[PDB]
Amino acid sequence: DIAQVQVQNKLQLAMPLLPQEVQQQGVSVEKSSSSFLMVVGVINTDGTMTQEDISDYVAANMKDAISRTSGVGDVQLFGSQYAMRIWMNPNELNKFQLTPVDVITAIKAQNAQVAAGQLGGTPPVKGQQLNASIIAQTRLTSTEEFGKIL
Amino acid sequence: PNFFIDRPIFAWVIAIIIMLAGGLAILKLPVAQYPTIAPPAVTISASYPGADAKTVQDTVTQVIEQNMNGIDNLMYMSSNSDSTGTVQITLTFESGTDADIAQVQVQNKLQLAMPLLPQEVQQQGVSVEKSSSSFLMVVGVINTDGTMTQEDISDYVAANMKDAISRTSGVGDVQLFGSQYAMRIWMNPNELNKFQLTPVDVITAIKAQNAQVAAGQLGGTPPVKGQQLNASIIAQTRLTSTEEFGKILLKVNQDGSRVLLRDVAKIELGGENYDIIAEFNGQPASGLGIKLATGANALDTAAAIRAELAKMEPFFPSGLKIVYPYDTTPFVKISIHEVVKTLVEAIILVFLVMYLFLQNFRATLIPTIAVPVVLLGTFAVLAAFGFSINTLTMFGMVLAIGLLVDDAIVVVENVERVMAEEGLPPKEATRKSMGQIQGALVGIAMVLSAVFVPMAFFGGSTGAIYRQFSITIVSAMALSVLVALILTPALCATMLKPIAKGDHGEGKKGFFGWFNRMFEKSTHHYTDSVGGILRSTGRYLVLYLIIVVGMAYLFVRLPSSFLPDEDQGVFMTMVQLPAGATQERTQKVLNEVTHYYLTKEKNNVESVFAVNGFGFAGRGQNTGIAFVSLKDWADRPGEENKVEAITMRATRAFSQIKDAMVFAFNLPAIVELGTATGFDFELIDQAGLGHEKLTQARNQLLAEAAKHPDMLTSVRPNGLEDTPQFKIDIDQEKAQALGVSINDINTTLGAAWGGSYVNDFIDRGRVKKVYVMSEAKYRMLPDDIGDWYVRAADGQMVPFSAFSSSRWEYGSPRLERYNGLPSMEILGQAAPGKSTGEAMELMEQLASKLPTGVGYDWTGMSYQERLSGNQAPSLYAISLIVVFLCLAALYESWSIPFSVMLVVPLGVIGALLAATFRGLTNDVYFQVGLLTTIGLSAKNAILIVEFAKDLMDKEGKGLIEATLDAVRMRLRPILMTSLAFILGVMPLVISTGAGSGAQNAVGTGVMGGMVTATVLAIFFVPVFFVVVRRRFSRKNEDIEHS
Amino acid sequence: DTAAAIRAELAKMEPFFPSGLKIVYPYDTTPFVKISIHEVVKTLVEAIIL
Amino acid sequence: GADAKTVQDTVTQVIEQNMNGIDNLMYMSSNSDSTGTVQITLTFESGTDADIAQVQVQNKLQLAMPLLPQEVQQQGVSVEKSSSSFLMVVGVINTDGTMT
Amino acid sequence: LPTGVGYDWTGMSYQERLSGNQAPSLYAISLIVVFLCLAALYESWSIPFS
Ligand SMILES: CCCCCCCCCCCCO[C@@H]1O[C@H](CO)[C@@H](O[C@H]2O[C@H](CO)[C@@H](O)[C@H](O)[C@H]2O)[C@H](O)[C@H]1O
């Protein structure tokens, strides 16, 4: 544990001089083994769901607890969690005279959470009688809302 | 053992050595109210100004809960996502985990999670802390002459006191209650619109004109050959005045007219945040929370703190007084004082019993020396094992007196008895007697710890609580026995006066003890009578079974606690208003409370500390809480002037005649613990569900626990209910159309209604924050949304009503999580005369009946309790098996032990009787009470049966004769012990004043137990030894032999 | 210990799996150590009988 | 580039404020630079656990964090186990075509 | 020096100050250890004083 601490307190002086891509994709520092103590499997017998559906159930319902189980160093995913996958057409893009870059900025823009504030906020004016939250732009939820992105 | 009887000085040296190590451990030992008891919890706290419950949950919370993997000995994880924009994630760890290593591991996993966070959060600071909730003291700061506002005060605390007190020795942690100064910039939407400017431009203005810039150096390295000058370049300097912030330029107009900040908005030194307002007896007040350093002496920390405060008093601003609303300290002062009172008095009573029974002063000086010595030693044994002088270990010792006391008496009496019996010189009488009780003392040491040790190995917070007692008491006992085989035998053999053969002092003297005949006759009455019973034992076996069935019934029909509640000079009452209320509406209630306590409790209440914005159920304008301090107990006489009755009448007062919920209450002595007959159930969203489904589950379960009043009571949700929240749907198209950048809409919306952290300025030498936010009057009512305009791309202003639609909805003000997943916390307690466990199992039954995607779980108080209770029967199996094996050793029978183990119920029936008539509760102190009582009665029967076995085997005397004799020769000391004891415990059983809950809890059970135990043992032990022995061997027989 | 505890967590989650989602155990270093040492205890008691 | 009197009451004293409840601290001394560096030294009771001490210090300091500057925040503040005496100084020179 | 200007020693002379401060306590304890020891082996209370 102290070794882990000593390594990571140099990792932390290295961090700001790293790419933002690496930095937000996440850096991990761990005391692990070298080989697998064990490999847990999940299958679907009745073929009802595809591989990715599954990889998603595993990553979205289990892997966070199994990685919090005391004494477990690293977990490795055979599969992957879900993502919003946006698969660009180079032609259909060139058609409308647009770049990937525009997609990037767009999605950053129409999809976010916003610090909004409060009616009857603190510090209010005398006798105010209502206190309630302002809910502004909210993160997206369906695939469609992503299709409808302007 | 003999060795010392021929060497009094060597023993004197061992005594001096134990006394000095104890003296040393006494001088430099930690004192705290309680030991570390609760599992270690580390909390990550973060704030996101203006955000809503779902914002902070889905932008910060879940990102942290996912990046918290692989941290060692994780027990459980819970979080709060406050719609007041704060998130708190508490990781409670396995008991005995390194507090410091756990915390470090957490803070460096969060530190890698940091970049995946929002920049507002990343710059507001994420914090990591060790979670006790036991501040040694809570010091208040106020102003009398109304001279300064609460924020003014808060700042004074931060800027003039907090640091010296954190230098005050013995003070480990200081925590601030209030809000530091900030640069508050309050925009006028109208004067903003006039000049065709947005908050956005304000933000950029302030970021740009206020900063420090990398400047450089003259004659820099590498200079040019022959260079002549070296000095620093000082550049653009951060602003300092409110004025200089006024002068910052926002736009130059067409006519050369200037737009200064001064123009569009008010600028003032003001609070960093205005949620929480604190009032100390109606006056403006702010304050500090002091935590006791790890290992520090509590009472000295407090003394130093008050000394530091007085050391600052000549330098205070006008009317700035320090007040002390919360101090655990005088209670520990009085508790410690009272336990010492007990120990010295117990010595006095043992001296007085020993005189009014042996009326020979130099005898009565022996146990007078012994105990003082043994205690001093146990303090050194503790210090050796890293413990402290605290409530648990001190009442551990008050209990131990009896095992120490008896042990000395047993010895000296046996010397006295031999000299007056056979006529030996002092010393040779000693070897007869020590030679007699030696194995008995070694046996008692092994059986007494055979019952006192296994209870130490209890796991959890319960287990730790026991470990304090078990260790204190066992060591006290082992040292008493070593002292009884080295020192007291040495002190007998040397200073004890020789008694003429066949003395017994019957009369001989006129003035001091015509008693001895009186006694003598009677101890014959008694032995005559015991023989009498030894004829017809059967009927006596019957009586015994009656005692046992009655005993078990007493045990079942007695209620368990964890600890007893205490008037602590202090209690508090809590305030909860209807959702959405105003800071000022809550405030009204709290002003009313403050006055109630300052009126209809004029005589009891010293101070009322009302806090608006923080209560128990949550943070918000909506909730307030009032910490109430009481006049010292010296001035509060009756039973009505005590917390029970006080909180009774406060709640009785605030229930009928109120529009909101106001309960008044007292805190448990262990300030973070199991509501005894209570529990903490977690309702868990497990499938890809939504908050609605979970809440429906929760109500559904509330209905089904509403269905079991015979099992369940007052089962309640521990969250905040969904409130009406205001939704602003932005149409992206309309706004892109008119030419307004979506950011501009969002962030001016932001800086308007939420506020924004902009920059930092250096105030009076201390770097502080700069907040840009609305003025009040333009952001209160929904319609005010309208005063706000967005400058479009081209150069035009746009109403929010051009691109925003609005409505009301429901949402949650508090979003809870358990172990990474959405949860809902449910509290509860058991039916009246039912068990906690039954209610918990019925809870699992009700919850198993809940809809799919909804599972269930246990946390906290019912974690520690549900896992650490399958242990008691196992540890008591160890205790009986081990004790029987010990006594089996001491004698030489597999069966003779049963005679002495059969004594246990004789003491128990005494306590269970002693309690039920006192209406007390089978708690820890009563349990430690039972073991202590069992400890003496086993001591006594082990001695009787010892002498019995000894007369039978090494003098060939007959069964009925040897038992009779044994019971005869130890009638006297049994009675001596029990007399002294019953007299020493008597005060604890009839006490009020400080802590008397604990005192009565120890005292009662034991006193009653002692009474029945001796006044039953001196008849039942003989029957045991006899009836047991009459299922043995052959011939011998009833014996007359060589 | 780590493994027995992990089996506990999965067991905790099992009722809430999607329809047809079974767990399978393709690889575990654990049962070999358990049965391997168990043979050695078998032997000590056997040898006492011998 | 900041000046000494700045770094002392913006970074230094802001850091010294959190070194309360640090176990076995003998004395604390510090320096505040116009070359923009600041260094605060905690010397402990003899036999206090070095690694454990580092743990506690960096865990009071990381709470002092919300009160420091972002240039400070981006070039890094480090917490380290410090001697004060060089065990040895290895020298390097070049004999022939003397590189610089 | 004027009011408000105090002093301290650190490092070499802190530690030196501690050697100082400790010598007397060291002599009381070490001397008392021998007195209590000789009083032990040579059972007399008197052999120590001599
Ligand atoms: C300090 C603690 C002591 C306080 C004690 C409080 C008083 C209560 C204790 C008394 C109990 C024993 O009481 C005792 O019972 C037996 C009867 O079985 C009597 O014995 C008598 O009755 C039976 C007949 O059935 C005969 O076999 C026997 O010859 C005869 O002596 C004793 O004479 C009597 O004294």
Side-chain angles (χ1 to χ4, degrees):
Chain A
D1 308 0
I2 277 299
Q4 193 200 46
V5 174
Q6 289 178 328
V7 152
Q8 178 143 2
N9 195 248
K10 286 296 152 44
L11 188 272
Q12 287 322 114
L13 283 172
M15 272 286 271
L17 314 184
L18 294 180
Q20 301 262 16
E21 289 95 22
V22 166
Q23 281 200 56
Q24 75 173 354
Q25 200 54 227
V27 187
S28 74
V29 182
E30 288 183 336
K31 46 181 176 59
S32 175
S33 84
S34 177
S35 166
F36 294 99
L37 150 64
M38 75 165 53
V39 170
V40 194
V42 189
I43 72 166
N44 197 87
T45 319
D46 45 337
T48 52
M49 55 202 306
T50 73
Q51 119 132 1
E52 8 288 305
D53 288 313
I54 286 172
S55 298
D56 181 67
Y57 191 85
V58 165
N61 307 268
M62 300 192 275
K63 179 172 171 303
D64 273 16
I66 302 317
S67 70
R68 269 187 262 95
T69 277
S70 186
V72 180
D74 205 35
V75 204
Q76 183 85 328
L77 247 192
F78 305 143
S80 196
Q81 184 179 258
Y82 273 161
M84 193 72 264
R85 270 324 198 103
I86 289 158
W87 308 95
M88 299 181 313
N89 214 319
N91 298 340
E92 295 178 308
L93 265 192
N94 202 35
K95 190 111 68 56
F96 301 174
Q97 303 106 43
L98 280 169
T99 42
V101 179
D102 300 304
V103 205
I104 282 169
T105 328
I107 308 166
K108 276 179 157 83
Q110 296 196 43
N111 176 37
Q113 279 282 339
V114 181
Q118 270 177 64
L119 316 172
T122 233
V125 335
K126 207 161 79 68
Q128 160 76 24
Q129 208 161 20
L130 168 85
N131 194 232
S133 290
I134 295 173
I135 324 298
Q137 205 183 340
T138 64
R139 295 281 191 59
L140 311 187
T141 308
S142 70
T143 250
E144 186 151 343
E145 313 198 341
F146 273 85
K148 298 185 183 305
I149 293 184
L150 180 61
Chain B
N2 228 3
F3 175 82
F4 297 93
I5 271 135
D6 274 311
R7 303 159 182 263
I9 264 69
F10 197 67
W12 267 121
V13 161
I14 288 176
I16 271 173
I17 272 176
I18 290 173
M19 289 195 299
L20 297 175
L24 213 261
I26 275 189
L27 207 8
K28 284 82 175 277
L29 209 51
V31 315
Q33 191 197 356
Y34 284 100
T36 297
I37 294 167
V42 179
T43 279
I44 322 165
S45 283
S47 61
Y48 191 178
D52 75 288
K54 193 192 292 215
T55 297
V56 290
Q57 178 183 251
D58 296 351
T59 312
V60 158
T61 288
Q62 288 177 28
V63 186
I64 287 175
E65 292 188 358
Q66 281 173 103
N67 273 102
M68 295 318 256
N69 48 338
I71 278 175
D72 290 327
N73 298 301
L74 188 56
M75 254 181 168
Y76 51 111
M77 186 180 62
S78 79
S79 66
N80 294 150
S81 317
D82 260 357
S83 60
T84 66
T86 47
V87 169
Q88 282 179 329
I89 295 184
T90 274
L91 301 86
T92 277
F93 288 105
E94 287 291 348
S95 308
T97 306
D98 189 355
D100 309 0
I101 257 61
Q103 193 202 330
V104 96
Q105 288 176 323
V106 148
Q107 180 145 231
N108 318 112
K109 290 297 153 189
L110 188 273
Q111 191 168 54
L112 286 170
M114 277 289 274
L116 309 71
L117 294 177
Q119 311 270 19
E120 288 96 23
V121 163
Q122 280 199 125
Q123 74 173 353
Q124 200 55 42
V126 193
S127 258
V128 189
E129 280 190 304
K130 234 105 108 200
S131 175
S132 85
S133 313
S134 285
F135 287 81
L136 152 65
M137 176 198 304
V138 170
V139 180
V141 190
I142 75 165
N143 195 278
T144 5
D145 20 337
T147 298
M148 55 201 74
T149 77
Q150 126 178 2
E151 300 87 19
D152 288 316
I153 287 171
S154 299
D155 190 69
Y156 189 81
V157 169
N160 305 87
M161 299 195 279
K162 173 178 169 304
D163 273 17
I165 278 77
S166 71
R167 275 191 267 99
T168 277
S169 51
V171 176
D173 210 88
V174 208
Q175 184 175 317
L176 249 192
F177 311 137
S179 300
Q180 186 181 41
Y181 272 157
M183 192 72 264
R184 274 322 193 101
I185 292 158
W186 310 91
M187 296 180 310
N188 214 321
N190 302 341
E191 292 179 309
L192 266 191
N193 200 35
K194 192 138 80 70
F195 298 53
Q196 305 142 351
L197 276 165
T198 38
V200 182
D201 304 306
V202 203
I203 282 168
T204 321
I206 311 166
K207 284 176 162 175
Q209 296 195 6
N210 176 38
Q212 276 273 333
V213 183
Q217 61 187 322
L218 315 173
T221 76
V224 329
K225 213 156 82 69
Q227 166 79 207
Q228 79 184 31
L229 171 84
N230 195 63
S232 294
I233 298 172
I234 313 297
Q236 201 181 337
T237 312
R238 294 185 174 256
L239 310 187
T240 302
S241 318
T242 162
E243 186 153 342
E244 310 196 339
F245 266 73
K247 300 183 183 181
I248 85 172
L249 183 61
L250 319 185
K251 179 172 65 180
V252 170
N253 278 322
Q254 12 80 4
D255 49 287
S257 72
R258 103 234 149 180
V259 184
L260 299 187
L261 186 49
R262 175 208 317 179
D263 306 308
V264 293
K266 275 78 150 64
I267 290 158
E268 59 181 3
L269 223 33
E272 197 159 313
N273 162 286
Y274 288 74
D275 293 313
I276 21 76
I277 59 169
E279 254 168 8
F280 175 77
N281 279 329
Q283 275 200 18
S286 168
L288 287 180
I290 291 99
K291 288 181 188 289
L292 189 263
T294 136
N297 193 264
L299 282 78
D300 292 328
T301 289
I305 280 167
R306 290 163 192 267
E308 189 57 48
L309 265 34
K311 266 181 213 283
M312 295 165 169
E313 202 74 357
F315 305 161
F316 277 162
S318 295
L320 190 123
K321 297 192 182 304
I322 273 52
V323 98
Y324 304 88
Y326 186 103
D327 216 356
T328 202
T329 278
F331 170 119
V332 172
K333 282 191 174 293
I334 282 84
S335 254
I336 270 171
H337 171 80
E338 300 293 30
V339 160
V340 151
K341 170 172 179 169
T342 275
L343 290 191
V344 157
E345 277 175 1
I347 303 166
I348 279 174
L349 271 172
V350 148
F351 174 99
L352 286 218
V353 160
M354 182 122 306
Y355 220 77
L356 307 157
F357 257 63
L358 306 193
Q359 357 200 205
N360 181 28
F361 197 57
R362 50 188 80 197
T364 186
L365 295 195
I366 286 173
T368 282
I369 284 175
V371 240
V373 175
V374 181
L375 288 189
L376 281 175
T378 307
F379 297 140
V381 186
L382 294 177
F385 288 151
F387 287 60
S388 67
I389 311 168
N390 63 71
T391 293
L392 301 187
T393 58
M394 295 312 289
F395 284 125
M397 304 215 337
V398 168
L399 249 334
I401 311 173
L403 249 53
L404 315 190
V405 157
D406 194 89
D407 276 6
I409 277 183
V410 153
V411 176
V412 177
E413 191 269 346
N414 216 73
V415 180
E416 290 297 277
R417 194 210 66 261
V418 165
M419 292 198 307
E421 240 170 81
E422 304 172 70
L424 301 174
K427 270 187 179 290
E428 182 85 310
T430 307
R431 295 196 178 106
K432 198 81 119 168
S433 61
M434 288 304 298
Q436 281 170 345
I437 60 170
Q438 256 177 159
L441 291 192
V442 156
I444 74 95
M446 303 291 95
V447 172
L448 281 174
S449 72
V451 281
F452 291 22
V453 164
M455 78 170 191
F457 288 51
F458 266 147
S461 295
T462 70
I465 289 190
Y466 287 116
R467 199 169 292 100
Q468 303 300 302
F469 289 84
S470 190
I471 252 118
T472 305
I473 298 173
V474 161
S475 285
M477 197 259 305
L479 277 168
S480 92
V481 170
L482 276 173
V483 163
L485 306 182
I486 289 170
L487 191 63
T488 106
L491 292 189
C492 274
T494 34
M495 71 194 304
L496 197 42
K497 217 168 183 172
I499 298 171
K501 182 179 154 79
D503 203 312
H504 294 238
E506 277 164 294
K508 273 190 173 186
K509 298 302 168 179
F511 273 93
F512 302 63
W514 275 31
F515 175 73
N516 294 274
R517 290 154 240 158
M518 321 226 309
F519 184 71
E520 202 59 42
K521 281 189 175 181
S522 33
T523 151
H524 179 70
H525 262 85
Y526 155 69
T527 181
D528 274 322
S529 186
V530 175
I533 71 94
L534 256 176
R535 187 181 322 166
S536 64
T537 57
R539 314 189 265 212
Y540 277 54
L541 279 169
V542 159
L543 200 73
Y544 185 68
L545 289 184
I546 275 171
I547 299 171
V548 165
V549 159
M551 172 211 60
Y553 183 60
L554 258 183
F555 184 62
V556 166
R557 275 281 173 186
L558 215 178
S560 351
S561 175
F562 262 72
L563 278 92
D565 300 344
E566 314 270 6
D567 170 295
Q568 199 139 3
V570 141
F571 77 110
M572 77 197 307
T573 175
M574 67 98 57
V575 167
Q576 195 74 34
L577 275 261
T582 317
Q583 166 156 340
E584 206 177 288
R585 292 225 283 98
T586 291
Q587 180 60 38
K588 166 185 157 73
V589 188
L590 291 181
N591 247 130
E592 291 187 31
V593 154
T594 293
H595 190 68
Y596 166 82
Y597 291 145
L598 294 205
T599 306
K600 290 184 205 299
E601 232 81 70
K602 192 166 162 73
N603 294 337
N604 311 349
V605 181
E606 174 55 30
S607 68
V608 198
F609 204 78
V611 154
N612 201 332
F614 190 55
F616 253 148
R619 281 169 62 170
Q621 289 170 28
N622 165 14
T623 189
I625 220 133
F627 168 55
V628 198
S629 302
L630 287 145
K631 286 258 192 174
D632 54 285
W633 352 46
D635 305 359
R636 292 182 285 138
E639 261 313 309
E640 70 259 29
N641 284 34
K642 309 214 88 184
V643 161
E644 268 267 303
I646 289 172
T647 86
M648 193 57 255
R649 74 163 64 90
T651 34
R652 126 165 254 266
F654 307 152
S655 49
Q656 270 144 111
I657 43 171
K658 254 8 270 163
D659 58 90
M661 204 88 276
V662 188
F663 281 356
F665 62 108
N666 182 255
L667 56 161
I670 289 157
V671 212
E672 52 267 306
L673 247 191
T675 65
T677 187
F679 72 83
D680 190 340
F681 186 131
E682 213 79 46
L683 201 60
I684 285 183
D685 160 28
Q686 226 126 358
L689 310 173
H691 179 287
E692 180 200 327
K693 268 82 87 66
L694 216 181
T695 296
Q696 173 106 10
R698 178 186 102 264
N699 290 338
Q700 195 171 346
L701 189 63
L702 282 161
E704 275 295 327
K707 239 98 121 86
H708 298 77
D710 56 285
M711 206 70 154
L712 299 182
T713 82
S714 63
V715 48
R716 24 81 179 275
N718 193 53
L720 253 12
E721 227 47 58
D722 273 19
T723 58
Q725 41 177 29
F726 192 81
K727 176 80 173 186
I728 297 179
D729 264 288
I730 331 294
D731 188 290
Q732 291 278 320
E733 202 144 323
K734 300 182 184 191
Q736 282 178 56
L738 287 161
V740 289
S741 181
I742 322 98
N743 308 141
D744 287 320
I745 328 168
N746 279 328
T747 96
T748 51
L749 172 59
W753 293 75
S756 185
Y757 180 78
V758 180
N759 247 25
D760 285 322
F761 75 112
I762 284 162
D763 176 19
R764 300 183 290 252
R766 272 167 150 268
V767 37
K768 310 180 190 187
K769 296 186 174 51
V770 182
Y771 270 77
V772 81
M773 191 195 294
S774 147
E775 190 152 320
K777 45 188 286 185
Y778 317 106
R779 56 154 183 86
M780 304 285 275
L781 300 158
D783 312 336
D784 275 340
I785 290 285
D787 291 312
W788 296 96
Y789 294 102
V790 182
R791 160 161 60 78
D794 54 67
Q796 69 162 353
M797 329 308 294
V798 179
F800 274 104
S801 48
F803 43 51
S804 68
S805 104
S806 54
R807 58 203 155 90
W808 283 73
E809 45 204 30
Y810 259 174
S812 182
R814 186 175 195 96
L815 289 163
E816 300 184 3
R817 310 184 73 74
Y818 195 79
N819 269 333
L821 310 178
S823 79
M824 287 178 92
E825 187 166 340
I826 302 161
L827 301 184
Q829 55 193 49
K834 262 87 181 323
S835 86
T836 311
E838 298 176 16
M840 281 181 51
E841 188 188 33
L842 197 266
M843 262 287 93
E844 292 176 333
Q845 289 178 304
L846 279 180
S848 63
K849 286 284 141 169
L850 306 180
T852 300
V854 166
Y856 73 100
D857 205 341
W858 296 97
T859 203
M861 295 314 123
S862 308
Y863 188 30
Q864 215 74 244
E865 280 182 17
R866 220 204 68 91
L867 285 200
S868 78
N870 310 19
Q871 281 183 317
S874 303
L875 279 182
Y876 277 146
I878 284 170
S879 269
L880 294 195
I881 292 172
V882 166
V883 157
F884 173 102
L885 269 40
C886 272
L887 294 177
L890 184 62
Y891 301 152
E892 191 65 28
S893 204
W894 297 127
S895 62
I896 296 170
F898 288 107
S899 62
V900 58
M901 297 200 314
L902 282 164
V903 187
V904 183
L906 283 57
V908 185
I909 190 86
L912 298 176
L913 218 112
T916 289
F917 265 30
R918 274 295 305 275
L920 262 293
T921 173
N922 167 17
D923 60 65
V924 160
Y925 292 152
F926 169 97
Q927 284 160 341
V928 176
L930 270 192
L931 285 198
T932 276
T933 289
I934 298 166
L936 288 186
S937 280
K939 177 95 176 290
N940 296 357
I942 278 169
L943 281 179
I944 290 171
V945 171
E946 180 91 326
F947 284 41
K949 167 56 60 189
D950 282 335
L951 298 182
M952 211 161 303
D953 276 20
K954 283 192 281 174
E955 287 192 34
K957 256 118 127 33
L959 177 67
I960 30 93
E961 201 194 351
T963 84
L964 266 164
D965 282 336
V967 121
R968 188 256 309 148
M969 51 204 292
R970 354 215 49 260
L971 178 285
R972 190 193 183 214
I974 302 312
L975 264 73
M976 277 195 289
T977 281
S978 300
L979 221 98
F981 197 51
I982 285 166
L983 277 202
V985 145
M986 189 203 61
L988 303 195
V989 192
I990 316 295
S991 196
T992 321
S996 67
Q999 287 186 16
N1000 301 359
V1002 168
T1004 288
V1006 134
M1007 170 171 285
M1010 282 286 302
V1011 155
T1012 72
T1014 65
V1015 191
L1016 245 62
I1018 59 166
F1019 294 81
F1020 269 80
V1021 185
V1023 202
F1024 290 144
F1025 184 83
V1026 164
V1027 177
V1028 162
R1029 202 55 183 154
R1030 295 190 191 166
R1031 285 162 206 163
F1032 189 69
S1033 167
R1034 187 71 61 205
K1035 300 188 182 312
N1036 305 315
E1037 287 265 303
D1038 270 37
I1039 322 177
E1040 147 62 324
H1041 195 39
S1042 328
Chain C
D1 286 326
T2 301
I6 283 169
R7 288 288 181 107
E9 190 59 53
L10 265 35
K12 271 178 214 159
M13 300 161 173
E14 276 180 340
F16 304 87
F17 285 179
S19 182
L21 257 223
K22 183 176 171 188
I23 287 171
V24 124
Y25 303 81
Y27 180 105
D28 212 353
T29 67
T30 289
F32 169 53
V33 177
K34 289 193 104 82
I35 303 153
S36 124
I37 271 171
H38 171 79
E39 286 287 32
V40 169
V41 148
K42 249 152 182 163
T43 268
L44 286 194
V45 158
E46 285 167 69
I48 296 167
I49 263 61
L50 269 157
Chain D
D3 75 297
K5 198 281 304 283
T6 302
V7 294
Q8 182 180 259
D9 26 43
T10 311
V11 168
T12 289
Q13 194 134 16
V14 170
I15 296 174
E16 293 189 359
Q17 283 173 252
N18 266 97
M19 301 322 192
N20 49 343
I22 269 177
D23 287 327
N24 303 136
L25 193 56
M26 251 183 168
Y27 47 64
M28 184 180 62
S29 71
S30 62
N31 289 149
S32 320
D33 252 356
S34 63
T35 66
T37 337
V38 46
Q39 283 184 331
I40 309 181
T41 282
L42 303 316
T43 328
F44 290 75
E45 289 293 350
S46 209
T48 309
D49 194 358
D51 308 358
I52 265 299
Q54 129 124 329
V55 175
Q56 289 183 329
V57 156
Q58 94 175 52
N59 286 1
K60 283 292 154 187
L61 189 272
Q62 244 58 256
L63 288 173
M65 268 235 272
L67 315 178
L68 301 178
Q70 201 161 21
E71 285 89 19
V72 159
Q73 283 200 5
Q74 77 164 355
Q75 201 47 40
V77 182
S78 71
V79 187
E80 286 181 21
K81 286 143 57 159
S82 65
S83 323
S84 181
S85 66
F86 290 143
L87 153 65
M88 75 168 313
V89 168
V90 184
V92 190
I93 70 166
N94 201 87
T95 52
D96 50 5
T98 306
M99 57 201 307
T100 72
Chain E
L1 307 180
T3 305
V5 174
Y7 65 83
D8 200 338
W9 301 98
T10 214
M12 287 312 270
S13 307
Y14 181 32
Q15 216 68 237
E16 188 162 351
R17 217 209 321 160
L18 182 130
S19 180
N21 300 18
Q22 279 188 319
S25 300
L26 216 214
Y27 298 146
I29 299 167
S30 270
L31 292 190
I32 284 175
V33 160
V34 160
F35 175 101
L36 272 313
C37 263
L38 294 181
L41 182 63
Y42 305 122
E43 183 64 28
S44 202
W45 220 218
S46 62
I47 307 322
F49 289 101
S50 60

